[model samples]
Target: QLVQHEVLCSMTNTYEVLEFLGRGQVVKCWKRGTNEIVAIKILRQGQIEVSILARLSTESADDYNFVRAYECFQHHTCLVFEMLEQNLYDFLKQNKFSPLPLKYIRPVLQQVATALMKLKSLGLIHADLKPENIMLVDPSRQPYRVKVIDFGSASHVTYLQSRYYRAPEIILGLPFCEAIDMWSLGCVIAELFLGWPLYPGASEYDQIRYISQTQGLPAEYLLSAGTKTTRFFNRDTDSPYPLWRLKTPDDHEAETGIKSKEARKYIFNCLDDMAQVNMTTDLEGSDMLVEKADRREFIDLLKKMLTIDADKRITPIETLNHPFVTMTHLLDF
Candidate 1:
């Protein structure tokens, strides 16, 4: 899938393809011009990104937190951007999936918070903000230069984020705003500290289950907002924790004969065990974990960002000013 030795001509410039970067439903190529290396993103549907990037470019050209789009043309359905080094996901993988040292992660969190605030100012929501969508300006450099990428799934509203980092409002199919990005930010921060996804659900049902097991169930208003709620919740139940019994197709007919109380008790026990498992798997001995004071501040910010109720979730501006972000030794961009 490499596009080496290929040449692409734009109206004003010519680029010789040097290598093929990885794809995310789109083609990515590294190209060499007279004096610069650039990344060209070929999109089948280029209008959305083109529009978003153009708006951002005109609104604030000096913002260094976002991936800078140098030029975009429709003839080849491609956009030329400043070539960045490995993405955050690849960086984590290269580190053997261990948590990043806090010294590096602190800057990343601050830069991402700045990017989110910029997006919010433009009345846009980056519906899919994750580690893969973030890139390092220079992987070998100190002070971790960060840039937010991938506007393919970005929208004003009504778009669900990737499942693992998705917000509770998106899962419940409720109306959402920019706060959803903050929720996804919380998940990304937790993953950076844990070296794994905070909620690795196999499916929509399992995703909701994992969330409820850790954060407790969604609020009553959120529960009733989505049409898909019935698929996951048992409406007839009067209990506070009325999660529907997750059953396999093979056991469907036989499970009907089981008593309701017995099933509830079994599910509750499983949830308790899951909670215990999460608590026991700590990064106690890891040098990557942050200091106690910083960790407490970071968790406090995460709790506000990860609030299940969208109305209560912290705004991007508030997150930018949070102690965890402001107090950290971060570069001002």
Candidate 2:
């Protein structure tokens, strides 16, 4: 809400604020000294996101999938960023949630994974990644060109991640690290192919149910040590403490009388269904997966990505060399 006014002025320039962006802290402003459009984030309020953004972009205005920001105005504390295009989530909605085609998915996910690698290199954790934060750079001319954005909630140190895309440890209030971003990346990939989130829960309670039912319940070690363990973890089986099992759909339904959505049979089951649904060469490249081997390698990688515990989850460096990304899956022994 900092720039809900007519203008934002720098030492020699007065930029016209077109409209306050979705978040109160940002505005899409244009330089009156010139007609260039740049989005500025009002730190109003380091602003961690800005610090991370500035550090990441300080070296180059281009390269990688991460969003690049211009220098900040010292007095205003507003950081300027290269204006980007529509986000992946909005792109999906406007198109009736049609899943993006397969050929593009491999590269799209590669970009996302590599983006996380940059954070991993810096000893940072984005702590936030989702369809909305993944933006399309040039919709038509360049195809699936995307850049990761919105570091406001990012962290070199960490806490929470967004719902749906949130990591299990965060949901359990357990100790976390960069692995959280890997978890978010997994969710983003699933949504791209399924046109829906794998853990589309209404609340944290349902979130556990959705994930557990598909991925199987999170490891017991996590439930035992998490600070907020008692919130979702329990004994089905409430011995003193460590003997815990997460609450079930029936448990919540009994308490609230609200039925739960049907649980997905497999983490990639819907995607498997998508593959079978349209095998024909129909509409550009909509088939979720083509080469039988291709689909197998993808699911294999996804299973590793969705590992219940962060310690065991695949890291971005390892992900970059996966058979799926490397095209080695096609070569059989």
Candidate 3:
């Protein structure tokens, strides 16, 4: 952490470091001239991406919900931004890590969806979208609004998603794009509802294993040309079209350790579809029909977002219009 009173001086403004704002590879500071508060993302070993940032910004883009940046200190390469409250992760952490209220998830999820939509529209990829990167703009009472941060790791790169929220295609070396962000958003949604990670793998091997156990394997077409296929799967000669198969986790025991644990036994079944969604016996909070229907829509949208095939995952623009996000389902009342 920077010394509490450290000052960063640049071309037009000065900022005095005040307090730590979680480890965003970031800090919270006080802008001197305006006597206003701001957050600065100091790029210690990261490069300055002026071209990228320039493309991502503008004041009039109301639909875009990324955290607002005021300036970049060429003196130290610190990117200054409009100050926001704690992140989604810490917000939950302060509540003793309880699940966020159902009343607030809509606002939180919708804004993040909006942010992701803007990135996808810009042909940019926020390779990272975990709870830490999503900041709560305000959290007093029903203040559940949020904005995504840390475009520092943003890129159209093939493989940079953090392991927990990493897309299935990334694990198999398949072609990746904006759809990868949808996969991360799925994890965030599940985490937001369950108050914990949906799939927290101890290692890469474990990560894929948990996904398979929960969602079944990635489709054959999705895995046929995976460059990393051999690392995680094997070829079956007798199977004419089946071609490749995933290796058993137990088969690679020496390389992988004991598997991880679920946060809790909370069951969530969105059995509002073709077949019944298998869920544990721990399901709760279904006292009202309206809530049940709301959850049904949420799960349906989540199903589209976390689908094994990136090709089939919902696009950012499509997500904004979903019944859950738009809350159009409530209009019948």
Candidate 4:
């Protein structure tokens, strides 16, 4: 791999090169200038055009999730970003997930939620929200400053981003909005604590079924779709697609409750084991069956974000008010 070095200068127009930060499928970053850093995102060279660059640079920085762009030079667009130390992925690798104290996780979540809200406020969707995209102000910045980056996969919510954190509705090819980020948030929350993705499915159907089994089905979710696999949407059967499952207070009989409690206990234990695996292997991921009250908090948020109907999905403002977010202050670091 080619190495890049950081450059420092007092002038804004100076072309100072800095150490290469890292590379994603879409963009690359480097340290540059005095007290300044630059992210040199190499958009598919063929994709670069005046219109796209103008749309990227001209847009109000506040309206988008990416670091504000100073200007776009030839071959690649040069984005001037606030210098940061490392991203969440690298941070986790250094200390491992076990070192993550709640003091850090809480405030980081808040900052990310705030960023998501900002994106939604401007009718934009991050489309991508993972550990790599979240970076920090300094190596000591615990929790992490957690800025959203990598806009190559991002769209105006017109289509979907990546499948890993994609919302269910988007998976179904329906029009989507900021709720997509909320779904990604759920994945991020789980990944931070558990050290991996919560639901790492091989395909869209697998992802949907994984979520449906845990959260149960909503009636409207089934009523709206029509397809061979989805046609068998019945709450009673263990069908991959369920329209809704009817629930009654009476269904909570003591026997049923006891069994449910046992099931929950088993699930929690499974999660603990998965956490152990991450610790042992030094990886960051989320397992579907998990324990811990905090896991539920993340799952609840995921449920809202994955609502089959876009309108019913939780939005950024609502997410900010969620108990998980409101009660925690970890992201500030």
> Which candidate has the top score in lDDT?
2
TM-score of model number 1: 0.80
Question: How far in Å is the alpha carbon of 21 misplaced in model 1?
Answer: 1.3
Ranking by lDDT: 2, 3, 1, 4
Candidate 1 Cα deviation (angstroms), residue 216: 0.3
lDDT of 4: 0.54
Candidate 1 Cα misplacement greater than 4 A, ranges? 1-5, 24-33, 59-64, 157-159, 237-290, 328-333
Q: Could you tell me which 10 consecutive residues in candidate 2 have the lowest summed lDDT? A: 269-278
**Candidate 4 residue spans exceeding 4 A from truth:** 1-12, 16-35, 44-66, 99-101, 141-143, 157-159, 217-303, 306-308, 328-333
For model 1, state the Cα shift of residue 78 in Å: 0.7
Write down the TM-score of every candidate. 0.80, 0.85, 0.86, 0.64
Cand. 1 Cα-lDDT: 0.70
> Where is model 2 more than 4 Å wrong at Cα?
3-5, 11-13, 33-35, 44-46, 74-76, 237-243, 253-290, 331-333
Clash count, one per candidate: 0, 2, 0, 27
Q: By lDDT, is 3 or 4 better?
A: 3
Error of 2 at 189 (Å): 0.7
